[PDB]
């Protein structure tokens, strides 16, 4: 999604559903290859230690002056009619300048946006309908005429324009947690295994304190841990090394 070939429009933002995987979030925070990094309700330093049911990477492009409208509970033409964020948005929004990638000779006019809609969209909603609306009862039904504006306006992304007009590839990282079990987690940074030393351990499922040492025992291919007769952990299998 970060290195995608091209981003969609702001009214037809592509909802990239991601589930059943693990990936680092601070890798982008400490990348120094972004123009905007502002999370809402969660810090990027702690996001690695949080699990969620599913996440969405909403890809779209907007102008530099329009990035201010991408926020939870913020009004605007692209916030109310193209892509609204909820008041309880516990995700993160990121963006980066794409003037050297999305620009074209004389300006890229392929990107579009919904200038207005009859009603405001719900959070995490997109509308690709080209239906036009009139002021009075005069029916247009397709082509324009007699004050029935066309809602989808085109973007002007010139290669030599100011920073407020250059294209910015935005990626809204939404997070969701429901009764279903959490599938999207971050990486748990492991340490070097120390043997024959009384050291505290923190394995995949079990934790404790004791002397870590190998033996001649053989667990089954699926058995990850081991306990004695009294339900006390007596042996384990290292998650990294079999």
């Amino acid at each position, epitope marked *: 999604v970060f290195n995608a070939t091209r981003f969609a429009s702001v009214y037809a933002w592509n909802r990239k559903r991601i589930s059943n995987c693990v990936a680092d979030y601070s890798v982008l925070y400490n990348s120094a290859s972004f123009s905007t990094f502002k999370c809402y309700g969660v810090s990027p330093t702690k996001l690695n230690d949080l699990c969620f049911t599913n996440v969405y990477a909403d890809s779209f492009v907007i102008r530099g002056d329009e990035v201010r409208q991408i926020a939870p509970g913020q009004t605007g033409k692209i916030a109310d009619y193209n892509y609204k964020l909820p008041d309880d948005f516990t995700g993160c929004v990121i963006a980066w300048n794409s003037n050297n990638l999305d620009s074209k000779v004389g300006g890229n006019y392929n990107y579009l946006y919904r*200038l207005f809609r009859k009603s405001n969209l719900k959070p995490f909603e997109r509308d690709i309908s080209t239906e036009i609306y009139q002021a009075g009862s005069t029916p247009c039904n397709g082509v324009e005429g007699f*004050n029935c*504006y066309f809602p989808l306006q085109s973007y*002007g*992304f010139q290669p030599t324009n100011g920073v407020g007009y250059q294209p910015y590839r935005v990626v809204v990282l939404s997070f969701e947690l429901l009764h279903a079990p959490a599938t999207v987690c971050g990486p748990k940074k492991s340490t070097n295994l120390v043997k024959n030393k009384c050291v505290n351990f923190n394995f995949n499922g079990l934790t404790g304190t004791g002397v870590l040492t190998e033996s001649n025992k053989k667990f089954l291919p699926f058995q990850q841990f081991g306990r004695d007769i009294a339900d006390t952990t007596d042996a384990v299998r290292d998650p990294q090394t079999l």
Partner: antibody
Framework: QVQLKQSGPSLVQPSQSLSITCTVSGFSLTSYGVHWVRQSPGKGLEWLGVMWRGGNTDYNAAFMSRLSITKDNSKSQVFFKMNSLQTDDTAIYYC???????????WGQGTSVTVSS | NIVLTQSPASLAVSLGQRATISCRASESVDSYGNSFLHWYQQKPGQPPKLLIYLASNLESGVPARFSGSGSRTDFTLTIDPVEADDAATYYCQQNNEDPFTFGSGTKLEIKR
């Protein structure tokens, strides 16, 4: 890239007809509208008509029966049939790309049509 | 013929000042949720170009100083800070009612 310069007229006499061919460039003629105006004949800037995105045409109250727009999608040329041109109608005609809210985003250089005996 | 009384006819604005160009209209309002119009700028050696559509949006090519607002009848353009590159006439095109006539034309002069 985006240029709608006009061509075709050389000299007009009073009470005559003549068409103006406007070059199309920078957008698809089949899905974008084309406006037509003059250049301040006396009072401020005026408006003549418009060809919508593949539909019908609208014109001013006074130029309803006199001026007409004809969009040729095969040749990518927009013709502007004029009728009953008087000496007071001397002005520069411009073409422009139709925007979202009936706006005129980009413009062309146009051509000066001189009406005189 | 929509009578878009754009006033004043011209202003001599110096560097680092604010320009004011009014636009009064009657026909009409309630397009979808607002009743704003478009603005333009014509240099003496170039045709006009769209600056502000619906009196609330910017356009690529010019800086962010071009902004404004307006009531149901009167509309105002705000250029702040004005510099020595604004020798051009500004117009007001109505979009809520036909015909799409323009304003009288306010020519800002570089007061040097």
């Amino acid at each position: 890239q985006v240029q709608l310069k006009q061509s075709g007229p050389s000299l007009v006499q009073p009470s005559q007809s003549l068409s103006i061919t406007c070059t199309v460039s920078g957008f698809s003629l089949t899905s974008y509208g084309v406006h037509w105006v003059r250049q301040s004949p006396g009072k401020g800037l005026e408006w003549l008509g418009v060809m919508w995105r593949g539909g019908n045409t609208d014109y001013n109250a006074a130029f309803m029966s006199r001026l007409s727009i004809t969009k040729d999608n095969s040749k990518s040329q927009v013709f502007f049939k004029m009728n009953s041109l008087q000496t007071d109608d001397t002005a520069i005609y411009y073409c422009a790309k139709n925007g979202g809210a009936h706006a005129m985003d980009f413009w062309g250089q146009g051509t000066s049509v001189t009406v005189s005996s | 013929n929509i009578v878009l009384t754009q006033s004043p006819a011209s202003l001599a604005v110096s560097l680092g000042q604010r320009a004011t160009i009014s636009c009064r209209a009657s026909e009409s309002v309630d397009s979808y949720g607002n009743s704003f119009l478009h603005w333009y700028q014509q240099k003496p050696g170039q045709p006009p170009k769209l600056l502000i559509y619906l009196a609330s949006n910017l356009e690529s090519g010019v800086p962010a100083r071009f902004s404004g607002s307006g009531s149901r009848t009167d509309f105002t353009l705000t250029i702040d800070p004005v510099e020595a590159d604004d020798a051009a006439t500004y117009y007001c095109q109505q979009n809520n009612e036909d015909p799409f006539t323009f304003g009288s034309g306010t020519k800002l002069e570089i007061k040097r």
